[PDB]
């Protein structure tokens, strides 16, 4: 029972689709009796595709064609990284129903691009929560946010500028994905900072923030 990889195919996206499984070149697919969201939280963690959103045990019309049902049973906690960290004891135990397949709609992961500037290390901030790129707001912006986003950018440390280059690097246009983002200084990236809900902003596009480092 070695799940090397669990690809997501037959779906609109790279990591939105049905769950497969790979062992010893045999591409196989997984049914499960207890197939919760935490299993998808594992599955879109070992692939590194965002947080897990939806986990449908949704059947389709029978002419799809499908691989057989994976031999072991996979029930675990969900806080772990890969499909090897939790046990898959009952090998050869196929107690799914007749013709069904699972489905995961985990998010595309957080790609963060500093746009509008001459270099990629200096520009207005733009983030990717959904498929649409969008800026973030400067409500209660702090130097902890600057050092967190520069740590995630992999581009050194902030210098805390005098706001003139940030106002000169562009107002931007589009949508504002984040407002009132608040980083504690220790988070690896911008998702793990406290913020208002994605896309719910009380600011216009004139308040798009820029981080210089």
């Amino acid at each position: 029972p070695v799940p090397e990889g669990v690809r997501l195919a037959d779906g609109p996206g790279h990591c939105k689709g049905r769950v497969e499984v790979k062992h010893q070149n045999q591409w196989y697919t997984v049914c499960q009796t207890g197939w919760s969201l935490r299993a998808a939280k594992v599955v879109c963690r070992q692939l590194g595709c965002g947080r897990a959103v939806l986990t449908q045990k949704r059947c389709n019309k029978h002419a799809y064609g499908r691989k057989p049902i994976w031999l072991s049973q996979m029930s675990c906690s969900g806080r772990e990284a890969t499909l090897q960290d939790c046990p898959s004891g009952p090998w050869g135990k196929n107690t799914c129903n007749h013709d069904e397949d699972t489905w995961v709609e985990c998010e595309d992961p957080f790609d963060l691009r500093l746009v509008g500037g001459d270099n990629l290390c200096s520009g207005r901030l733009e983030v990717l929560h959904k498929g649409v790129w969008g800026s973030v707001c400067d409500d209660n912006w702090g130097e902890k946010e600057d050092q967190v986003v520069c740590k995630q950018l992999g581009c050194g440390k902030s210098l805390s500028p005098s706001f003139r280059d940030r106002k000169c690097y562009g107002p931007g246009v589009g949508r504002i994905w984040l407002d009132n983002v608040r980083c504690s200084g220790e988070e690896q990236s911008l998702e793990q900072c406290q913020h208002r809900f994605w896309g719910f902003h009380d600011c216009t596009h004139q308040e798009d923030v820029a981080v210089i480092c």
Binding site: K57, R58, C59, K61, N97, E100
Partner: protein
């Protein structure tokens, strides 16, 4: 006899539409027919997915068929034929989705436990008052600190019609927590799922600190030079 439909509880929590009829052990039969037949006539195959485990327990099984298409949401005359040679009359049951029921959003009210109840210092009953929903089926789950509470902690009633309203229903959900949890100020959130809700789920939270206050202390600082808030 029973044929439990997928409600909005089974639709939303599990994301799997399972047609289920329960064949109680009236008499032991070898080839128990729990064949879930469509109005079209094709049968999505189910057989003994879980035993009934009734007090008699004489060859009783539950057949759950995953007709998970849009044909249930649109609607069809689905029939499981509980036809048996023992008691030779076929004790079948037919269930369909109820058609054209008007959709009104639930107004969800979270009632804190009574002051009379906390004086006993034994248990606190938090009431989730889901009322005003005209489609009958509703799913109510309690969470504390973002973790789903166990279903033995809370008990939710069947929806019954609201008295003054014509066809709108109401439901309760009584969460029985110990008094030392509620008096320390622990947030108990009522997650309720309904079709007529815009985001499909409403979360009311209650705790002692929000509650009903027993000492408002207001300070209307009328300052000339306020201008911007600080």
């Amino acid at each position: 006899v029973f044929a439990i439909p997928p409600s909005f509880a089974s639709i939303f929590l599990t994301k799997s539409t399972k047609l289920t009829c329960l064949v109680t052990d009236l008499t032991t039969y070898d080839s128990v027919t729990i064949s879930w037949t469509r109005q079209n006539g094709e049968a999505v195959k189910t057989h003994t997915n879980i035993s009934e485990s009734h007090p008699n327990a004489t060859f009783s099984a539950v057949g759950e068929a995953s007709i998970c298409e849009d044909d249930w949401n649109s609607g069809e005359r689905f029939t499981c034929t509980v036809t048996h040679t023992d008691l030779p009359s076929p004790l079948k049951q037919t269930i369909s989705r109820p058609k054209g029921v008007a959709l009104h959003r639930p107004d969800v009210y979270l009632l804190p436990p009574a002051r009379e109840q906390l004086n006993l210092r034994e248990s606190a009953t938090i009431t989730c008052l889901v009322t005003g929903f005209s489609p009958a089926d509703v799913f109510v789950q309690w969470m504390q600190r973002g973790q789903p509470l166990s279903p033995e902690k809370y008990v939710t009633s069947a929806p019954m019609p609201e008295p003054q309203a014509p066809g709108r229903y109401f439901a309760h959900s009584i969460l029985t927590v110990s008094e030392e949890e509620w008096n320390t100020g622990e947030t108990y959130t009522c997650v309720v799922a309904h079709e007529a809700l815009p985001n499909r789920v409403t979360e009311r939270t209650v705790d002692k600190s929000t509650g009903k206050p027993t000492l408002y202390n207001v300070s209307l600082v009328m300052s000339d030079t306020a201008g911007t808030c600080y």
